[PDB]
Design a protein around this ligand. Sequence first.
Ligand SMILES: [Mg+2]
Ligand SMILES: [Mg+2]
Ligand SMILES: [Mg+2]
Ligand SMILES: [Mg+2]
Ligand SMILES: [Mg+2]
Ligand SMILES: [Mg+2]
Ligand SMILES: [Mg+2]
Ligand SMILES: [Mg+2]
Ligand SMILES: [Mg+2]
Ligand SMILES: [Mg+2]
Ligand SMILES: [Mg+2]
Ligand SMILES: [Mg+2]
Ligand SMILES: [Mg+2]
Ligand SMILES: [Mg+2]
Ligand SMILES: [Mg+2]
Ligand SMILES: [Mg+2]
Ligand SMILES: [Mg+2]
Ligand SMILES: [Mg+2]
Ligand SMILES: [Mg+2]
Ligand SMILES: [Mg+2]
Ligand SMILES: [Mg+2]
Ligand SMILES: [Mg+2]
Ligand SMILES: [Mg+2]
Ligand SMILES: [Mg+2]
Ligand SMILES: [Mg+2]
Ligand SMILES: [Mg+2]
Ligand SMILES: [Mg+2]
Ligand SMILES: [Mg+2]
Ligand SMILES: [Mg+2]
Ligand SMILES: [Mg+2]
Ligand SMILES: [Mg+2]
Ligand SMILES: [Mg+2]
Ligand SMILES: [Mg+2]
Ligand SMILES: [Mg+2]
Ligand SMILES: [Mg+2]
Ligand SMILES: [Mg+2]
Ligand SMILES: [Mg+2]
Ligand SMILES: [Mg+2]
Ligand SMILES: [Mg+2]
Ligand SMILES: [Mg+2]
Ligand SMILES: [Mg+2]
Ligand SMILES: [Mg+2]
Ligand SMILES: [Mg+2]
Ligand SMILES: [Mg+2]
Ligand SMILES: [Mg+2]
Ligand SMILES: [Mg+2]
Ligand SMILES: [Mg+2]
Ligand SMILES: [Mg+2]
Ligand SMILES: [Mg+2]
Ligand SMILES: [Mg+2]
Ligand SMILES: [Mg+2]
Ligand SMILES: [Mg+2]
Ligand SMILES: [Mg+2]
Ligand SMILES: [Mg+2]
Ligand SMILES: [Mg+2]
Ligand SMILES: [Mg+2]
Ligand SMILES: [Mg+2]
Ligand SMILES: [Mg+2]
Ligand SMILES: [Mg+2]
Ligand SMILES: [Mg+2]
Ligand SMILES: [Mg+2]
Ligand SMILES: [Mg+2]
Ligand SMILES: [Mg+2]
Ligand SMILES: [Mg+2]
Ligand SMILES: [Mg+2]
Ligand SMILES: [Mg+2]
Ligand SMILES: [Mg+2]
Ligand SMILES: [Mg+2]
Ligand SMILES: [Mg+2]
Ligand SMILES: [Mg+2]
Ligand SMILES: [Mg+2]
Ligand SMILES: [Mg+2]
Ligand SMILES: [Mg+2]
Ligand SMILES: [Mg+2]
Ligand SMILES: [Mg+2]
Ligand SMILES: [Mg+2]
Ligand SMILES: [Mg+2]
Ligand SMILES: [Mg+2]
Ligand SMILES: [Mg+2]
Ligand SMILES: [Mg+2]
Ligand SMILES: [Mg+2]
Ligand SMILES: [Mg+2]
Ligand SMILES: [Mg+2]
Ligand SMILES: [Mg+2]
Ligand SMILES: [Mg+2]
Ligand SMILES: [Mg+2]
Ligand SMILES: [Mg+2]
Ligand SMILES: [Mg+2]
Ligand SMILES: [Mg+2]
Ligand SMILES: [Mg+2]
Ligand SMILES: [Mg+2]
Ligand SMILES: [Mg+2]
Ligand SMILES: [Mg+2]
Ligand SMILES: [Mg+2]
Ligand SMILES: [Mg+2]
Ligand SMILES: [Mg+2]
Ligand SMILES: [Mg+2]
Ligand SMILES: [Mg+2]
Ligand SMILES: [Mg+2]
Ligand SMILES: [Mg+2]
Ligand SMILES: [Mg+2]
Ligand SMILES: [Mg+2]
Ligand SMILES: [Mg+2]
Ligand SMILES: [Mg+2]
Ligand SMILES: [Mg+2]
Ligand SMILES: [Mg+2]
Ligand SMILES: [Mg+2]
Ligand SMILES: [Mg+2]
Ligand SMILES: [Mg+2]
Ligand SMILES: [Mg+2]
Ligand SMILES: [Mg+2]
Ligand SMILES: [Mg+2]
Ligand SMILES: [Mg+2]
Ligand SMILES: [Mg+2]
Ligand SMILES: [Mg+2]
Ligand SMILES: [Mg+2]
Ligand SMILES: [Mg+2]
Ligand SMILES: [Mg+2]
Ligand SMILES: [Mg+2]
Ligand SMILES: [Mg+2]
Ligand SMILES: [Mg+2]
Ligand SMILES: [Mg+2]
Ligand SMILES: [Mg+2]
Ligand SMILES: [Mg+2]
Ligand SMILES: [Mg+2]
Ligand SMILES: [Mg+2]
Ligand SMILES: [Mg+2]
Ligand SMILES: [Mg+2]
Ligand SMILES: [Mg+2]
Ligand SMILES: [Mg+2]
Ligand SMILES: [Mg+2]
Ligand SMILES: [Mg+2]
Ligand SMILES: [Mg+2]
Ligand SMILES: [Mg+2]
Ligand SMILES: [Mg+2]
Ligand SMILES: [Mg+2]
Ligand SMILES: [Mg+2]
Ligand SMILES: [Mg+2]
Ligand SMILES: [Mg+2]
Ligand SMILES: [Mg+2]
Ligand SMILES: [Mg+2]
Lengths: 272, 44
Amino acid sequence: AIRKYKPTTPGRRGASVSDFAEITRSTPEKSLVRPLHGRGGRNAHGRITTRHKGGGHKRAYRMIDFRRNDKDGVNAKVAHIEYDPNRTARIALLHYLDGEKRYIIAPNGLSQGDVVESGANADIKPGNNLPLRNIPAGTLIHAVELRPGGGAKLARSAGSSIQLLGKEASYASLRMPSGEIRRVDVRCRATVGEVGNAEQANINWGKAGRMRWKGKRPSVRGVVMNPVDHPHGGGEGKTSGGRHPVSPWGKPEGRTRNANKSSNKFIVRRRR
Amino acid sequence: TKGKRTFQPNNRRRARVHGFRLRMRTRAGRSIVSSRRRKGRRTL
RNA sequence: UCGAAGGUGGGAUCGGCGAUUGGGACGAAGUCGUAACAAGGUAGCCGUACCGGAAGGUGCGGCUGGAUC
RNA sequence: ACUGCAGGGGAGACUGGAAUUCCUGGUGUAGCGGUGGAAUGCGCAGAUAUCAGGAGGAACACCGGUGGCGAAGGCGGGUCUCUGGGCAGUAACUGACGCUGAGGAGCGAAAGCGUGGGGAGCGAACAGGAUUAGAUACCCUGGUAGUCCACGCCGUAAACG
RNA sequence: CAGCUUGUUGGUGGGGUGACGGCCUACCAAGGCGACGACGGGUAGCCGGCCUGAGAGGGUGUCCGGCCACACUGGGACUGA
RNA sequence: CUCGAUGUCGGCUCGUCGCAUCCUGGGGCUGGAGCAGGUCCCAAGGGUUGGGCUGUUCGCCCAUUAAAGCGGCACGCGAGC
RNA sequence: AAAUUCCUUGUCGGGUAAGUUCCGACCUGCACGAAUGGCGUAACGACUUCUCAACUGUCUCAACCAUAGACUCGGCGAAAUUGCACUACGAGUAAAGAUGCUCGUUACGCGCGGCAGGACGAAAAGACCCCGGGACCUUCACUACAACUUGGUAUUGAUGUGCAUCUAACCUCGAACCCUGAAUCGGGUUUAGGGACAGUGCCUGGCGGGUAGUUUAACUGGGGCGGU
RNA sequence: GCCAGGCCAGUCCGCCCAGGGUGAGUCGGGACCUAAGGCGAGGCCGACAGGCGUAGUCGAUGGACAACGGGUUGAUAUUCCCGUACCCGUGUGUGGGCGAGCGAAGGGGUGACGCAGGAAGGUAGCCGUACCAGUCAGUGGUAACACUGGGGCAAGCCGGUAGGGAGAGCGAUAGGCAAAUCCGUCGCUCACUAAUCCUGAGAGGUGACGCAUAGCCGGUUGAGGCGAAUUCGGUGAUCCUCUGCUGCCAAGAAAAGCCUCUAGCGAGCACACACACGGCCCGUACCCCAAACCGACACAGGUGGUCAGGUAGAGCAUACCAAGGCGUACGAGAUAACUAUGGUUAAGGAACUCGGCAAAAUGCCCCCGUAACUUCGGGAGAAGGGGGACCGGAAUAUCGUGAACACCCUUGCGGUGGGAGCGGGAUCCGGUCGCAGAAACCAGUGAGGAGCGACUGUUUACUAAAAACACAGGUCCGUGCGAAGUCGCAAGACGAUGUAUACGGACUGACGCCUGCCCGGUGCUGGAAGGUUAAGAGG
RNA sequence: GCGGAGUGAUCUACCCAUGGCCAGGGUGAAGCGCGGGUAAGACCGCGUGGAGGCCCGAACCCACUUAGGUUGAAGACUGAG
RNA sequence: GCUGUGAAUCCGCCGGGACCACCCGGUAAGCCUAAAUACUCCUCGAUGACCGAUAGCGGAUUAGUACCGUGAGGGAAUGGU
Ligand SMILES: [Mg+2]
Ligand SMILES: [Mg+2]
Ligand SMILES: [Mg+2]
Ligand SMILES: [Mg+2]
Ligand SMILES: [Mg+2]
Ligand SMILES: [Mg+2]
Ligand SMILES: [Mg+2]
Ligand SMILES: [Mg+2]
Ligand SMILES: [Mg+2]
Ligand SMILES: [Mg+2]
Ligand SMILES: [Mg+2]
Ligand SMILES: [Mg+2]
Ligand SMILES: [Mg+2]
Ligand SMILES: [Mg+2]
Ligand SMILES: [Mg+2]
Ligand SMILES: [Mg+2]
Ligand SMILES: [Mg+2]
Ligand SMILES: [Mg+2]
Ligand SMILES: [Mg+2]
Ligand SMILES: [Mg+2]
Ligand SMILES: [Mg+2]
Ligand SMILES: [Mg+2]
Ligand SMILES: [Mg+2]
Ligand SMILES: [Mg+2]
Ligand SMILES: [Mg+2]
Ligand SMILES: [Mg+2]
Ligand SMILES: [Mg+2]
Ligand SMILES: [Mg+2]
Ligand SMILES: [Mg+2]
Ligand SMILES: [Mg+2]
Ligand SMILES: [Mg+2]
Ligand SMILES: [Mg+2]
Ligand SMILES: [Mg+2]
Ligand SMILES: [Mg+2]
Ligand SMILES: [Mg+2]
Ligand SMILES: [Mg+2]
Ligand SMILES: [Mg+2]
Ligand SMILES: [Mg+2]
Ligand SMILES: [Mg+2]
Ligand SMILES: [Mg+2]
Ligand SMILES: [Mg+2]
Ligand SMILES: [Mg+2]
Ligand SMILES: [Mg+2]
Ligand SMILES: [Mg+2]
Ligand SMILES: [Mg+2]
Ligand SMILES: [Mg+2]
Ligand SMILES: [Mg+2]
Ligand SMILES: [Mg+2]
Ligand SMILES: [Mg+2]
Ligand SMILES: [Mg+2]
Ligand SMILES: [Mg+2]
Ligand SMILES: [Mg+2]
Ligand SMILES: [Mg+2]
Ligand SMILES: [Mg+2]
Ligand SMILES: [Mg+2]
Ligand SMILES: [Mg+2]
Ligand SMILES: [Mg+2]
Ligand SMILES: [Mg+2]
Ligand SMILES: [Mg+2]
Ligand SMILES: [Mg+2]
Ligand SMILES: [Mg+2]
Ligand SMILES: [Mg+2]
Ligand SMILES: [Mg+2]
Ligand SMILES: [Mg+2]
Ligand SMILES: [Mg+2]
Ligand SMILES: [Mg+2]
Ligand SMILES: [Mg+2]
Ligand SMILES: [Mg+2]
Ligand SMILES: [Mg+2]
Ligand SMILES: [Mg+2]
Ligand SMILES: [Mg+2]
Ligand SMILES: [Mg+2]
Ligand SMILES: [Mg+2]
Ligand SMILES: [Mg+2]
Ligand SMILES: [Mg+2]
Ligand SMILES: [Mg+2]
Ligand SMILES: [Mg+2]
Ligand SMILES: [Mg+2]
Ligand SMILES: [Mg+2]
Ligand SMILES: [Mg+2]
Ligand SMILES: [Mg+2]
Ligand SMILES: [Mg+2]
Ligand SMILES: [Mg+2]
Ligand SMILES: [Mg+2]
Ligand SMILES: [Mg+2]
Ligand SMILES: [Mg+2]
Ligand SMILES: [Mg+2]
Ligand SMILES: [Mg+2]
Ligand SMILES: [Mg+2]
Ligand SMILES: [Mg+2]
Ligand SMILES: [Mg+2]
Ligand SMILES: [Mg+2]
Ligand SMILES: [Mg+2]
Ligand SMILES: [Mg+2]
Ligand SMILES: [Mg+2]
Ligand SMILES: [Mg+2]
Ligand SMILES: [Mg+2]
Ligand SMILES: [Mg+2]
Ligand SMILES: [Mg+2]
Ligand SMILES: [Mg+2]
Ligand SMILES: [Mg+2]
Ligand SMILES: [Mg+2]
Ligand SMILES: [Mg+2]
Ligand SMILES: [Mg+2]
Ligand SMILES: [Mg+2]
Ligand SMILES: [Mg+2]
Ligand SMILES: [Mg+2]
Ligand SMILES: [Mg+2]
Ligand SMILES: [Mg+2]
Ligand SMILES: [Mg+2]
Ligand SMILES: [Mg+2]
Ligand SMILES: [Mg+2]
Ligand SMILES: [Mg+2]
Ligand SMILES: [Mg+2]
Ligand SMILES: [Mg+2]
Ligand SMILES: [Mg+2]
Ligand SMILES: [Mg+2]
Ligand SMILES: [Mg+2]
Ligand SMILES: [Mg+2]
Ligand SMILES: [Mg+2]
Ligand SMILES: [Mg+2]
Ligand SMILES: [Mg+2]
Ligand SMILES: [Mg+2]
Ligand SMILES: [Mg+2]
Ligand SMILES: [Mg+2]
Ligand SMILES: [Mg+2]
Ligand SMILES: [Mg+2]
Ligand SMILES: [Mg+2]
Ligand SMILES: [Mg+2]
Ligand SMILES: [Mg+2]
Ligand SMILES: [Mg+2]
Ligand SMILES: [Mg+2]
Ligand SMILES: [Mg+2]
Ligand SMILES: [Mg+2]
Ligand SMILES: [Mg+2]
Ligand SMILES: [Mg+2]
Ligand SMILES: [Mg+2]
Ligand SMILES: [Mg+2]
Ligand SMILES: [Mg+2]
Ligand SMILES: [Mg+2]
Ligand SMILES: [Mg+2]
């Protein structure tokens, strides 16, 4: 699924690309597309709050249904599998039998033209969105919501999946692809299956310019900065940074999760 | 940047950056306009 | 026109020497161990991998050209 | 060709239980572990032990054999799907179409290599303990690669009857 | 030493030779050799014979005799059967 | 002395001066037979090479030469490079 | 023997007539070494470095030509600088390098084109150095503070046995509805959760070059180092 | 006008003075639309100041939107005038038709979009040419189609070519906030191998019985008046078909507008033609690789976009020219040194020098040929060679491009052949000339060995372009989601309309082989048995 | 130099939205076809195709070297590369 | 002033410089209140052992003008027959 360019040039020596073999209809569905402009990592203040962003290809936002709440019982047909610049997963254009047009994250094994069910009575097939109550323990799921009706937020990048670990009383315990065991409410809904495009992590971008196309801007190491710019800066030759590694803002490496965050009650075991 | 000087005139940008309405939109700007009236500047 | 010799050039190929370096063989009554031959003192060998001054050690699989019931 | 026959022959998917390890809790207290003897180590912050639940990986006890199958290497938890070979019988068919095979091609234990997963237990390297004159070992305590999976590469074994 | 061959393989019309012949030439087609070893590298004059051996073989090619090649090294014509 | 500035090494260019003389010139002594030298004295008129290495000065080396002198002049000379 | 080797032009070999540079090694590594990566590496380099061919005025060693200036004439017409001035040289002397002082020597007055030795020429109140001040930078200098974090207490309640449960405070960027005509804002209502927790106030410990203000002596045959 | 200014002078002038001059329904903007962003009713947040932001409203560099050709002034012209158009709106008549018709809330569709690359059909332009009109240049020749000039014309409208675009209906309808006959989804019949409809470059007609033009007669050489021919080829776009087609991954605005639906409005309407009218505001002069802009200057600098012909050329290089500009503002002399910019140089050829710095050299097209090494792509234009001009012949169809008179067939911008003239390229053979055939201008030096950095890139504007930075790749750490991190006192925002194959931070820096030992110190992570301890409580 | 309050991104740094521009040569990736090869493939040869922080090279953007300028034509330029 | 806790209504409460007793003084947690005080952009009227055009206002004069700066800002010179 990954096609490697030949070393016809130093920028393509080890480079690779997705063969896009799963994609049909290289254009997006017009009614389902909304505009999107780059921010350069700038917030409302106009200042860089996320470094290393900017440039990058112009993009259009497709609306993905991370809810799948309002069409329980009405069936959908996977009309198309299509590129989406906004995520690493591919997207699936579903035609609902009531005539509604929808985009969803494309799981493994939802080739064009097959049927997706939603609701408590849905079959346990890749792409079917059900409550965790009706999803049995042990199956691989994705696009699972943290709160009932809040929309999918968990395991929705390419190749990601939760497995449902168990359901004791009213909370489903589940292993998050970070390896973290978390409990969510059983009425949180998830779509059955791994997220597709699982092989895109193997893409070797060949050159700097390609990451510039994807919108990443050059990152400068703190150790080649001056002391005024970075705690690691300074030194006559090259140094290791004259101190324990810290961020550009002097923050030491270490746990940054709020130790008294309210979600600790649902987090069962932190990642390894 | 060879040969290009610092002041490249553009009257619309002059007005939108230093203009009367820009001045009047903030207290500092109104303070400046009143200070220039008080000094007696012809141009405000 | 063809033409030997000659000239120019880049290759091919066969040799010599070469600071330095590597192993081999044969030598002596040298130094360090004792790896194999007995269950050789941890059975030994084969391939492979890693490690160790050195023989060697260990892992994985295999063999009996070893054992045990 | 037809009728039968035996089989761990192969591949894929799903799946079962014992056991080890770890986690959560219950009990419970000062040992546990290990050895030729110890120590390193684990525990007293609650270990070992014991009960319940759970996670995960690997291998499939009893059947099991001296046996069966496969060209060899090798092959067994179960089920399903696909699939190769072999043996017997009838004499229906072809009518020497056979044998071998330089080169060549494919398959080829284990180790190893690449990428991506996985990682219980074991365990090269490594580290400590012990033994010892020394101990780069054998023994102990840990333990990384690896062992497992997918796909390639390697193409070697006392690949032996 | 696994790819060697372009006048190379063949044909036509010519030329040329004592004579056939790519021997040479114009044109046309794209063939010829090779694992039975092409092409290449090394070595070598070959033979009846001589030495040895029971023979088959092995070594060798000196006297004699036969054949070939050469004549300081390399290239070319002349006369003349 | 100079900090309200006296530009630092080497090279180049141009020099100029001293003699403690490298050559050429004149001599004494010699452990000067001759050829060559050694040493000292007098002598500054002229001459006193081109390269390799090094930023170099210096130095070593190559090839020469009658000889390949030593020093000063803001370690002469950047309002000359 | 290195972008690292002081000794050092180490030693051996190669390249040159001759090689402190270069290449290959030796290992005696002043002071290499594995992601401040180690060792290699095809391709790439207006990088650094060494060699060869070609080529040439780079050079031996210069010559000539044209043009723009320079020069002359006419027109216009600045500048830095400037204590003066009918501003020699030698040997001296002197704040120790003299146009200006001494003793001599030399020199008719004035222009023009050139040169650049001096006027310690001009230019910038020396960047070096030291002293005083400052700035910024660093940190296990000092003292603070932000941020982060701890507990008490208020917000903050009920029931049982700190623990658990509850819901009503409070919280929700979960959902629906309404203001709303246009609203991914906001607010309200309902619901679904969380929940006396969290957050916040006051008090409090910690941490804190993230930030800030500062200090960091003097003597000294310059300062530093050493010593005092 | 000339006393300042203009680097001199000045009668001149972008200087001084006065007067004059800029004409739009269609051009560029507004009255239309929105992007980024700005402001922002209420609002949320914040001691105050204020921050942010919803509705909304602005905001072109983009979307939509109706005009062309010629003439004229001293100065404006797609603006004035002429000729011919097109767009929006208004009123009045006539004719016949329908009692439908309008629907702009909202829905839906469209609008609507990247990069790269052609090909084909064309066109502009250009080069010739039929034809037309002028000229006879006292030089050796040259009286005609030799030479010189011409060999033109739009928007609009009509017809509709090549090429492209499409299945057509019927029914249901859980979706598009209400509705929908629209859209979406689903289902069924016909045909498909076909016809039909739409769009439709170019070409044709009309515009044009007009305009323009070479030129001619007379002419303060002003202004006039007249005014020919305009055909057929070649070549050929940076333009059109083409918002197409193909390929690719990095996956490529919005809104209005337009169409359609229904909600709604509706007793009157739609439509045609004729006439008569209304079309607003702002800009419009002049300068624009500049003497009028940014550089204090009439300053060797900078300044976005459009057009941009000929010959040679691959070319928008270059050389010389066209159209069109200009000689641009100190001059005149003069063989000084010297400086600068160029040029040439015997013999030698790096001996120069820190260093081949600079210069020289190489240089083009085609054909041969091309090493170590390699990551199999490269290295490579490796290196190293050969040919190159003109003339003639091959050469009537040599060849390949484009495709006319006159013959044949489903009647057409149609087809079969046919080959004229017009261009292109290559070869071979012969000859000719020079010192030289790449002709001038233009236009790679090459090879070998190290170090560093893999590479393209980036950097100290104004002494450093590198070995520095970045980079793809690697690893570690953080982060379970208004995440972590960051900006903010907060609200809020970015992160991200992302969700661990993700995001942030750190170090390393393609790729290959690898990455050993140490957890003592200091950090970080986890643990909580005990010691220590603040406020609080206590008293 | 320190503080308070303001002014500046018409230069420059980065980013955002929306436009524009890049003569002419060259190389020849994927893919796609045909053929060979075997049973089928691998794979190979031809075409086609036109990729690439690809090559040469104008505009354009830079600023490596060098000479000139250095009271400049210019407070950073010019010539040649 | 903020945080916590949190009264009492005269046989109360507050002050008298920790605090206690006595004594003295006063009635917090509501508001309003002239005059004497401060100031002069501006209007009149005077004044000066004040200035007299480089002074006096920056400004006798185009004066916050010209000019400089993107901007905030800076900011002249010039009188006499
Ligand atoms: Mg703002
Ligand atoms: Mg980043
Ligand atoms: Mg730095
Ligand atoms: Mg900074
Ligand atoms: Mg710091
Ligand atoms: Mg540093
Ligand atoms: Mg260092
Ligand atoms: Mg040797
Ligand atoms: Mg032994
Ligand atoms: Mg052994
Ligand atoms: Mg032993
Ligand atoms: Mg043994
Ligand atoms: Mg072994
Ligand atoms: Mg071992
Ligand atoms: Mg074994
Ligand atoms: Mg089987
Ligand atoms: Mg179990
Ligand atoms: Mg575990
Ligand atoms: Mg336990
Ligand atoms: Mg247990
Ligand atoms: Mg038969
Ligand atoms: Mg064989
Ligand atoms: Mg195999
Ligand atoms: Mg294995
Ligand atoms: Mg592996
Ligand atoms: Mg390994
Ligand atoms: Mg792995
Ligand atoms: Mg062990
Ligand atoms: Mg050990
Ligand atoms: Mg498998
Ligand atoms: Mg073998
Ligand atoms: Mg075996
Ligand atoms: Mg022939
Ligand atoms: Mg013949
Ligand atoms: Mg014949
Ligand atoms: Mg011989
Ligand atoms: Mg015999
Ligand atoms: Mg013979
Ligand atoms: Mg003989
Ligand atoms: Mg002889
Ligand atoms: Mg004869
Ligand atoms: Mg002075
Ligand atoms: Mg003397
Ligand atoms: Mg003598
Ligand atoms: Mg002399
Ligand atoms: Mg004399
Ligand atoms: Mg040399
Ligand atoms: Mg001298
Ligand atoms: Mg000197
Ligand atoms: Mg000297
Ligand atoms: Mg000097
Ligand atoms: Mg001097
Ligand atoms: Mg070196
Ligand atoms: Mg050395
Ligand atoms: Mg070396
Ligand atoms: Mg390290
Ligand atoms: Mg490195
Ligand atoms: Mg570069
Ligand atoms: Mg001259
Ligand atoms: Mg003069
Ligand atoms: Mg004099
Ligand atoms: Mg003197
Ligand atoms: Mg004197
Ligand atoms: Mg005097
Ligand atoms: Mg003079
Ligand atoms: Mg001087
Ligand atoms: Mg001076
Ligand atoms: Mg000073
Ligand atoms: Mg610290
Ligand atoms: Mg707290
Ligand atoms: Mg609190
Ligand atoms: Mg500080
Ligand atoms: Mg202070
Ligand atoms: Mg001191
Ligand atoms: Mg001292
Ligand atoms: Mg005048
Ligand atoms: Mg004048
Ligand atoms: Mg408001
Ligand atoms: Mg706002
Ligand atoms: Mg807005
Ligand atoms: Mg607007
Ligand atoms: Mg616009
Ligand atoms: Mg005009
Ligand atoms: Mg008209
Ligand atoms: Mg779109
Ligand atoms: Mg074409
Ligand atoms: Mg004549
Ligand atoms: Mg003509
Ligand atoms: Mg429909
Ligand atoms: Mg037409
Ligand atoms: Mg044409
Ligand atoms: Mg005009
Ligand atoms: Mg100007
Ligand atoms: Mg000028
Ligand atoms: Mg100019
Ligand atoms: Mg040109
Ligand atoms: Mg002149
Ligand atoms: Mg010469
Ligand atoms: Mg010569
Ligand atoms: Mg030479
Ligand atoms: Mg030299
Ligand atoms: Mg040389
Ligand atoms: Mg020299
Ligand atoms: Mg050069
Ligand atoms: Mg040159
Ligand atoms: Mg090379
Ligand atoms: Mg070449
Ligand atoms: Mg010809
Ligand atoms: Mg010829
Ligand atoms: Mg000749
Ligand atoms: Mg680089
Ligand atoms: Mg390049
Ligand atoms: Mg610089
Ligand atoms: Mg530079
Ligand atoms: Mg990275
Ligand atoms: Mg991670
Ligand atoms: Mg946060
Ligand atoms: Mg780190
Ligand atoms: Mg680095
Ligand atoms: Mg390490
Ligand atoms: Mg520790
Ligand atoms: Mg300040
Ligand atoms: Mg501002
Ligand atoms: Mg800007
Ligand atoms: Mg701006
Ligand atoms: Mg091209
Ligand atoms: Mg291809
Ligand atoms: Mg490129
Ligand atoms: Mg252009
Ligand atoms: Mg430009
Ligand atoms: Mg730059
Ligand atoms: Mg220079
Ligand atoms: Mg240039
Ligand atoms: Mg009261
Ligand atoms: Mg009162
Ligand atoms: Mg009051
Ligand atoms: Mg009062
Ligand atoms: Mg008063
Ligand atoms: Mg008054
Ligand atoms: Mg005054
Ligand atoms: Mg101004």
